[PDB]
Amino acid sequence: TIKLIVGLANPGAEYAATRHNAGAWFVDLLAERLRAPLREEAKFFGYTSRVTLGGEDVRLLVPTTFMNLSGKAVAAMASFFRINPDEILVAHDELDLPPGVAKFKLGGGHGGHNGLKDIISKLGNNPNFHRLRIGIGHPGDKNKVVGFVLGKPPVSEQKLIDEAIDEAARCTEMWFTDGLTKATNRLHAFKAQ
């Protein structure tokens, strides 16, 4: 089962609407719907909250370390509550999926995402945690990636990302009540059928 949900981001109003904060948008949505506000806790290097999802006790985390230093926050929370890597779900922006699509994945590398890279490192070089890949599209080549992920999406793309995040939230809840297989089958069918 999942005990911790992490949403990757950079802190501050300066980065709030940028693509690289897609993971945080997901966590914010969960907290908003449950009316369980996130509060920054120094000890965990990020915003935290505790909610009941599908009847289960789940903790939320949005690091305030800056993206490339995210591992520090995930490791601090996981160590205090004694949570295993496969009991963690990390939501993040995904260049390899278009806006409007989202997918679950267990393990694998970081694929060039520096937030994921640091988490793998800080968990003791262990990539075996779950991920919610939120599609943001790809600009074309590596040279344009920096300005793209740190850029704000046009309104039409934002609407598509919001739809995927909403569906992803419902499927995450389904994971708790009905299991990962059913939750995955529903999410991966979104926009595919």
Residue with tokens 């300066």: 14
CA distance 66 to 92: 14
List, in sequence order, every beta strand (DSSP E) within the chain. Answer: 4-7, 39-41, 46-53, 56-63, 88-94, 102-106, 130-135
Amino acid at residue number 148: F
Is 75:125 a contact under the CB 8 Å cutoff? no
Residue with tokens 């299991």: 179
Give the DSSP letter of residue 45: T
114 belongs to an annotated ligand binding site = yes
Catalytic residue among 20, 92, 113, 130: 20
Dihedral sign, CA of 132, 135, 136, 140? positive
Q: Which has the closest alpha carbon to 36: 22, 23, 50? A: 50
20 tagged catalytic: yes
Residue 142's domain comprises 1-193
CA distance 125 to 127: 6
Q: Is 14 exposed, middle or buried (0-12, 13-18, 19+ CB in 10 A)?
A: exposed
Experimental structure resolution, Å:
1.2
Q: Which method was it determined by?
A: X-ray
* CATH classification of the domain holding 191: 3.40.50.1470
Total domains, the chain? 1
CA distance 117 to 126: 10
Amino acid at residue number 58: V
